């Protein structure tokens, strides 16, 4: 019910932001300014956790700089798992809880990401929202595809056929 | 697998549940007819037997609803297993925790594949649809909209019509 | 963003490609030469793990064979567990580590598949991941996408028209 993307609005001078979701480590919260391009931001110079679930921006970051949204995302690192059971440890239940929480967080981040990929139009048609598809195989064993190179070549073919 | 729809077929009561669910609340049933509406538990459903749900009312197409659903929604904020120090650490708890996480992962997988998804031959399944919104293509491998083509062989398709 | 699916351009006579993703078992690593069609190799007959994190193809497999990229991929069997806890077991640390690793890896696979379908890539453009839209599709509005069959008809009708 709680997503992990939270595309916000810069709307000029607004330095505070909220985190509806919950995270394990500070590093798992990734915030990238959005606009003409996307840029990741660092800690102690762009972020500051004023309080749990409160990101503070050091610079005003209005649209003048060329950005429109913040998109607070949660990304739990997989390689850097929080807990690694050792041979001589005591096996506190806290370790098991932390591990299970981390895996659940990764899965939840997965469901939210798929709703953050290609959308579908209300009428039942795929919608690219003004984007352009790229690097799609120009294989035409079937009757349908949509690459650009063979389009150009067969455009040349049809054009010279007409010129005939 | 997780998402399975059934045609109402006028009057019917029972419907099989293919997938596995750790808790009753996870199974979600929606009347996807004129509008997709959920139904409450122990009011419109009565489960009945593991792997089977029971509807209290017929709910035929004449009632305004054509199809139902058995989507699984495993909770991500509530954990069926919550380990504590003062416990015998039953293995079934360990297995249940892992299975719950895998179930959430499968939910994500099927939700992604709900829209355009890969084919058995590693191909995108548009499923007889068209990409209504598509920006201009300016690369060799890009997907060309219809206007850009209108500024190409379309001219030729008319220049040869005369 | 994807970390468990890497695509390397074959480049004629090359055979070594590293595996940055951590695979629990060899059988969970699949290599699929992408070309005119996707081909799947086998262990000890087409390629071998020269050592951990690297695979040596037996043959060059360059573009001359119609395949351009290798696209080695990770897939962890969700149904089959590498570690299953029993009642009278001994609970080795390795067992807990393996269970947690497998769960986290399947979550990674979920995220990878989330991004595999057409979605925003690093450059910010919907990416076909070198794959081909295959079953049906037709154009109607000038702003929509075009199937290949429509263009084929547009060309062949013009050709036969000229042929009169």
UniProtKB/Swiss-Prot annotation, chain B:
Subcellular locations according to the entry: Virion
Assembly information from the UniProt record: Homotrimer. Interacts with tail components gp11 and gp12.
Assigned protein family: Belongs to the Teseptimavirus fiber family.
Function recorded in the entry: Structural component of the short non-contractile tail. The tail comprises six fibers made of gp17 trimers, 2 nm in diameter and 32 nm in length. May attach to host lipopolysaccharides (LPS) to mediate primary attachment to the host cell.
Protein name: Tail fiber protein
Organism: Escherichia phage T7 (Bacteriophage T7)
Lineage: Viruses, Duplodnaviria, Heunggongvirae, Uroviricota, Caudoviricetes
Span within the parent record: 6 to 167 of 553
